[PDB]
């Protein structure tokens with residue numbers, strides 16, 4: 001049943017039909033050790049391309065550099081954060097990335113992984129702005145379910 | 153204690169990535185459970201068969217068979233499974249919508265160090281669209297998967 005849990009985890013991770021990745025900060029430049037299918041479709045990249053690399057490639061010319069700063073802080077201060085950022089596909093098509101980052105720790109408090117979940121959403125009206133903040137909760141829910149899965 | 157589970161959950165993530173990088177049609181089943189149900193199915197297998205993971209996880213792979221599936225060839229699979237030995241046969245199977253195809257299938261048991269069978273690996277290949285040439289590739293894919301699962 002030891003290696004069975006490995007097959008199950010793989011499968012439970014593949015069933016999470018949502019945009020996410022997992023990085024290992026221990027490894028050089030905190031690279032991507034797993035990317036979901038949805039994330040691949042959304043960004044138009046293959047695994048061969050993105051595995052072993054840091055996720056900064058999604059950024060581009062009009063990506064707000066100041067929002068990227070907060071992600072450095074969160075990572076270097078090994079803590080979560082949620083932002084909305086301008087990202088690009090492999091070709092170069094823009095999309096608003098309602099992105100959430102958060103760490104995953106062992107019992108010794110050492111950060112083992114960072115779970116990163118992305119959401120897309122095309123004026124900032126009452127229904128439009130409350131929809132954005134509901135999305136930010138959904139990206140969390142997801143991030144937690146990924147955490148719950150990996151642990152259990 | 154923690155560390156027994158850290159390497160356990162780390163290798164479930166790596167397995168998920170290595171397995172999915174094979175980019176071939178395959179499933180893994182657990183003979184200890186009733187009906188030797190599917191505990192993993194690759195992305196290409198779904199593309200091929202048209203079913204989704206929820207539609208096939210836990211079920212037996214017999215659902216791929218239909219009207220013109222040669223029961224003698226299916227009998228050879230039974231004997232291979234009962235006698236826990238590999239086999240490579242050519243068989244008519246059907247997608248979810250009902251489309252036929254020649255399934256150049258390869259079964260092989262994933263055995264432990266003591267010799268007993270732990271899982272079964274199944275590799276499919278559409279060969280109707282190079283006869284025994286595909287038999288080698290299907291067997292290669294089996295080993296890829298075998299090694300992937302046992303890696304640790």
Ligand SMILES: Cc1cc2nc3c(=O)[nH]c(=O)nc-3n(C[C@H](O)[C@H](O)[C@H](O)COP(=O)(O)O)c2cc1C
Pocket residue numbers: 021022023030054055056058059068071072075085087097099101114115116117118
């Ligand atoms: C798990 C994880 C997921 C990330 N996902 C994204 C992302 O989807 N889009 C993005 O622009 N940056 C993402 N980042 C941020 C960058 O990969 C990078 O780590 C961050 O910008 C660090 O700043 P630097 O690039 O200036 O070193 C992610 C980081 C982590 C740890």
Ligand SMILES: Cc1cc2nc3c(=O)[nH]c(=O)nc-3n(C[C@H](O)[C@H](O)[C@H](O)COP(=O)(O)O)c2cc1C
Pocket residue numbers: 179180181188212213214216217226229230233243244245255257259272273274275276
């Ligand atoms: C891992 C694995 C993969 C299998 N893949 C297929 C397949 O792709 N196509 C198929 O027609 N049968 C496949 N089978 C065979 C059926 O699951 C089943 O063993 C067959 O129907 C014979 O048993 P029965 O006497 O219950 O019908 C596979 C079996 C295993 C264990």
Ligand code: NA
Pocket residue numbers: 014036037172195
């Ligand atoms: Na997948």
